[PDB]
Amino acid sequence: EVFNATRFASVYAWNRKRISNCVADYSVLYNSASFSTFKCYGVSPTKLNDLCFTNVYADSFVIRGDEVRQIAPGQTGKIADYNYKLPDDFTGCVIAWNSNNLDSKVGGNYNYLYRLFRKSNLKPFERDISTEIYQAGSTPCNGVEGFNCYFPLQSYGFQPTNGVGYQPYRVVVLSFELLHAPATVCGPKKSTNLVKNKCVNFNFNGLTGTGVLTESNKKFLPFQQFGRDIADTTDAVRDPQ
């Protein structure tokens, strides 16, 4: 639904949807209709099908063709400054692909809006929804849009005969967590029967290890998920199924 979505939001109002409590299938998306840049940080793209994540934030916007470069944690530029701030140690994957066929229209699509003015650089994942008239000049404007008083929102002008570097690229940023809460999104890996009292390799919700599993007489409270030892070694687990 997000990837096939027809109507995309403006970059300064980049749309964020949470994804959770669903089996995901990343390999079929990685098998790509020539996505311009499926580029991943903090995780190897082939393995994405194996990890379990707590939640997967997905952010969507449409930007220039060649400006995709700016979507990086340690990056600078107008987009990184006044539109979208990827935090350092970002753990996710950036997807971009050209949408010249759909988005760009003859004469220039003008409804796409990117900002160019703000007091300071955006915070990590900051949404400057407000459209107050910028005091661009040294003199206060207080509602003036004169020659030295400027408006903070600017249209793009997507026309098909623009530069290839200026064609409309749709961009979707997937931000993972890799925390240890109940990991409610995970790949299509099958379940398996359980066996006890034997040294077996195991994966419980991406929590992997090797050991012998025995029935335990611990009194977990209902909100508990697993146990840990005096020196931080996983000692007991709750079976998911």
Partner: antibody, heavy 119, light 109 residues
Framework: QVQLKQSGPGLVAPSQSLSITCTVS????????ISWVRQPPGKGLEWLGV???????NYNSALKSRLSISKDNSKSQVFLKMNSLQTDDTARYYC??????????????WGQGTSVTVS | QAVVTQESALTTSPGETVTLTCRSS?????????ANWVQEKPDHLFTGLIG???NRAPGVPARFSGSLIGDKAALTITGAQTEDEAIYFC?????????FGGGTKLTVL
């Protein structure tokens, strides 16, 4: 191609109201502002008013507050309204494109012109 | 504090350059009040010649050359035999609104 269009019947009798519209292609109302100029027969051009790029209107101070101008961001249309005419108001009216963002801060393009006559 | 004027008279033989001056009510004009030059064809055709009190418009030939030559705003066109037969208006940005010049008739040879 960048182009300005403006259309309206024009023929008006005294003391009633007619409105004129300006329709634009090749640019967005977000990247530019629109100003209107008026050309009476044989006399110099005078500035009517301007619509700012992202909301907010301006009007000529001496020009009556009993009038309004309006625009369409999505379909790129602009409408000028005069609610009561008098025989001195007969003139040709022109819409124009103003780019205060651009290095060429002044008005870039102008409308193709409409005749407005009294009786 | 609102008078705008032009000589309304211009005639230049080809090969020699001429300056026409538009004078406001504030004495010497500064770039702070932006100056504009527009040209009127006898068919009610308008175009932009000079902007920003020093900047030529896009698409108008560089033979058109306008600066703050005098104390007040001015424009200079090198002599042309055919295409200079037109009217020229000077525009000044007061703090609140725009004022347009009277218009100057050029009749080459």
């Amino acid at each position: 191609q960048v182009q300005l269009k403006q259309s309206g019947p024009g023929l008006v009798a005294p003391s009633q109201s007619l409105s004129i519209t300006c329709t634009v292609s090749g640019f967005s109302l977000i990247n530019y502002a629109i100003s209107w100029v008026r050309q009476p027969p044989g006399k110099g051009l005078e500035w009517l008013g301007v619509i700012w790029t992202g909301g907010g209107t301006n009007y000529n101070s001496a020009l009556k507050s009993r009038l309004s101008i309006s625009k369409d961001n999505s379909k790129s249309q602009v409408f000028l309204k005069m609610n009561s005419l008098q025989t001195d108001d007969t003139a040709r009216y022109y819409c124009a494109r103003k780019d205060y963002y651009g290095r060429y801060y002044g008005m870039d393009y102008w409308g193709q012109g409409t005749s407005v006559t009294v009786s | 504090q609102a008078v705008v004027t032009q000589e309304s008279a211009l005639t230049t033989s080809p090969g020699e350059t001429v300056t026409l001056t538009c004078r406001s009510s504030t004495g010497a004009v500064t770039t702070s009040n932006y100056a504009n030059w527009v040209q009127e064809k006898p068919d009610h055709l308008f175009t932009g010649l000079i902007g920003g009190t020093n900047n030529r418009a896009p698409g108008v030939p560089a033979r058109f050359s306008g600066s703050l030559i005098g104390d007040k705003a001015a424009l200079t066109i090198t002599g042309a035999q055919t295409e200079d037969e037109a009217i020229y208006f000077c525009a000044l940005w007061y703090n609140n609104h725009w004022v347009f010049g009277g218009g100057t008739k050029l009749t080459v040879l």
